[PDB]
């Protein structure tokens, strides 16, 4: 909204007036405050939202700004006469008046803001339910059944684990959005934030390795016998988690809970200068957990197209050939679904971080949160893709229901 901005500019210029050498600074600050004040007076504060413009509460609210403006005018009169310190003193009085008579009306979130929290809570809940149940089923199926122990399925186990973990955090994140605070302590704050990064890194790294596995199964059938075993897949899974802990561990450490503006926030506290390391991390995340892995996957499939399209006998049997081909198609589809789901938020974050966009615009904030939600949706979508695209997962699904 405009009100919160106008209110921020009032505060910011009061601080300018406190530490000011000369009357020009004071006059300029006061004049800006007056424009903000007049603008603020035209708003409907969240606490009086959908109340009549001519209601007692609205009249009183507007009246408070007539008083502020009157005081800004007196302070400005003084500043124009050269009387800096008296103007500074007069401005200290605004702060009192403002707090004593206008403060009450500001504070709350708007209905639109609460609407957003409810919609997010709705989506996160649906995602959590389908995602958590779905991936726990996949993991149970892979362990429980002999026929499931395959190199490709061990990789899938790793995706399901990352997705199970990621979706388990959503109810806590939902609660935060509804309550506008973090009531779960620091340890669970550390857990939720680091799990977010683990999901992103372990997932794409695993999809990269599934693409490489497929590349080897198709273009190097003889060497594939050497490389493509369940045990080695498991080994690569572990390596993926170890490697991803290069980002995961720092995040555990930097994740803290702090009291701020009457709430507890769970946040990442980067070392000084915070803005610099925050931005280094974001560009690193974007490159090493999205762009570079996608190049590798693209290359792997590019080289596979030469053999997949321009041949007929890949293996020495009909059953194996079609089995090698559909598993390869599944991996591409799972990869595709991952990129579609994650690309929007990843682009948004870079734009949000680097470009001067209106970060308080209702539409931008709605779109952003939709894009964040789409990233999590990937986790609930994947179990359904395995059921749709793979013979043994369909049979495992049907045996359950």
């Amino acid at each position: 909204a405009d009100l919160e901005d106008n209110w921020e500019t009032l505060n910011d210029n009061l601080k300018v007036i406190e530490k000011a050498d000369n009357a020009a600074q004071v006059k300029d600050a006061l004049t800006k405050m007056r424009a903000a004040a007049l603008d603020a007076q035209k708003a409907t504060p969240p606490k009086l939202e959908d109340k009549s413009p001519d209601s007692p509460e609205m009249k009183d609210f507007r009246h408070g700004f007539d008083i502020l403006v009157g005081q800004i005018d007196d302070a400005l009169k003084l500043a124009n006469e050269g009387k800096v310190k008296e103007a500074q003193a007069a401005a200290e009085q605004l702060k009192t008046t403002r707090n004593a008579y206008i403060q009450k009306y500001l504070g709350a979130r708007s209905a639109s803001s609460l609407a957003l929290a409810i919609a997010i809570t709705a989506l996160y809940s649906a995602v959590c339910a389908v995602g958590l149940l779905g991936n726990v089923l996949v993991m149970f199926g892979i362990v429980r059944y002999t026929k499931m122990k395959t190199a490709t399925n061990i990789y899938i186990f790793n995706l399901a684990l990352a997705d199970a973990l990621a979706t388990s955090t959503l109810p806590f994140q939902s609660a935060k959005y509804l309550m506008e605070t973090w009531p779960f302590g620091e340890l669970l704050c550390k857990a939720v934030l680091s799990i977010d990064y683990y999901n992103m890194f372990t997932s794409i790294f695993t999809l990269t390795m599934m693409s490489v596995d497929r590349y080897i199964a198709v273009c190097h059938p003889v060497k594939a016998l050497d490389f493509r075993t369940p045990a080695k897949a498991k080994l690569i899974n572990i390596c993926i988690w170890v490697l991803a802990s290069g980002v995961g561990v720092p995040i555990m450490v930097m994740a803290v809970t702090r009291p701020r503006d009457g709430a507890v926030v769970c946040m990442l506290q980067f070392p000084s200068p915070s803005w610099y390391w925050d931005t280094v991390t974001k560009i690193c995340v974007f490159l090493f957990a999205f762009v570079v892995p996608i190049l590798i996957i693209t290359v792997c499939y590019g080289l596979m197209l030469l053999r997949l399209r321009s041949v007929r006998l890949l293996s020495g049997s009909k059953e194996k050939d079609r089995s090698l081909r559909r598993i390869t198609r599944m991996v591409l589809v799972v990869v595709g679904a991952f990129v579609v789901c994650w690309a929007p938020i990843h682009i948004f974050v870079i734009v949000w971080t680097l470009v001067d966009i209106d970060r308080r615009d209702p539409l931008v904030v709605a779109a952003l949160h939709l894009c964040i939600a789409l990233g999590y949706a990937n986790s609930s979508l994947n179990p359904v893709l395995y059921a749709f695209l793979d013979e043994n997962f369909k049979r495992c699904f049907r045996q359950l229901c």
């Binding site: 934030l193 977010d196 990064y197 992103m200 926030v265 769970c266 946040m267 990442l268 974001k282 995340v285 938020i345 974050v349 964040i372 990233g375």
Partner: peptide
């Protein structure tokens, strides 16, 4: 992803 992402957070403050």
């Amino acid at each position: 992803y992402x957070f403050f």
